Each structure stands twice: as C-alpha cells, then as structure tokens.
C-alpha cells in the first residue's frame, strides 16, 4: 500500500518546484538568521547539524545563542542525528508534535522527508515572526 502523501505529487508532478520549494524554506530560516544578519543556502544540510536549529529558537526570541552552546559539535552521523533528535525534543515540547520523517531522514541531507517537516514549520512561523 504505497501511502500517497506530499512527496507523491511533488516528485511525481513537480521535481522542479520541489527544488524551489526548498529555497522557500531557506527563506524562513534566512529570517531567523537575517536577525543576526546572515544568509543560509542549504536547508537540507542545515539539519545535518541541528546547529542552525537551536539558532532559530534564539534569533526568534532575540538572544545570544553561540553555535557551540547547545549540544556538542556534530562530528559524525550519529552526532548529527542527535542534534536533530534534540531539536525535535525541545520542539515536541514547544509543539511540532511528532514529526513525520525521522531525525535521520532529516540529517540525511535528503529533501523529501526534510521537506515534510520544514513545511510543518513554515506553517507555524508563517504568521508568527
């Protein structure tokens, strides 16, 4: 039973918009970043570190969040899957509920899954600064 979801049409009817769609997710993050006045370019690998993630939490509330203040620095994969399972932890609390894909599917630099979750955010921040 191939469960049909979002990637279905996105990949089966818009392999091009899927690319531009990631770039729109780069914009929402460019917002949490534009605060410290910066610029992101790889939403996919931005979770391959969960670093830019804890930064969102701070640049949103407006505070000093050093890149090495949250969990240690991701060195290998497991360490990255962690930094994302963690963002997923303060998120499951701060809301977000249960993400669809898995902390790996995100760090996996893959777009498909990572996009289903990024959508979830664009949804909650689209109206909230």
């Amino acid at each position: 039973r191939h469960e049909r979801d979002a990637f279905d049409t996105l990949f089966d009817h818009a392999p091009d918009k899927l690319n531009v769609v990631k770039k729109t997710l780069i914009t929402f993050v460019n917002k949490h970043l534009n605060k410290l006045n910066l610029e992101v370019t790889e939403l996919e690998t931005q979770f391959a570190d969960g670093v830019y993630l804890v930064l969102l939490m701070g640049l949103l509330e407006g505070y000093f969040v050093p890149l090495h203040s949250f969990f240690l620095t991701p060195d290998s994969f497991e360490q990255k899957v962690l930094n994302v399972s963690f963002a997923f932890e303060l998120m499951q609390d701060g809301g977000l509920e249960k993400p669809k894909p898995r902390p790996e599917d995100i760090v996996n630099c893959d777009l498909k899954s990572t996009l289903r979750v990024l959508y979830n955010l664009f949804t909650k921040y689209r109206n909230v600064e």
Partner: peptide, 10 residues
C-alpha cells in the same frame, strides 16, 4: 498538497 504549496507561494 501541490496546488496549495503554489497557491500560497504565488
């Protein structure tokens, strides 16, 4: 949610 993704990205 294709039609929607673009109906909002307009």
């Amino acid at each position: 949610d294709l039609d929607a993704l673009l109906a909002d990205l307009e």
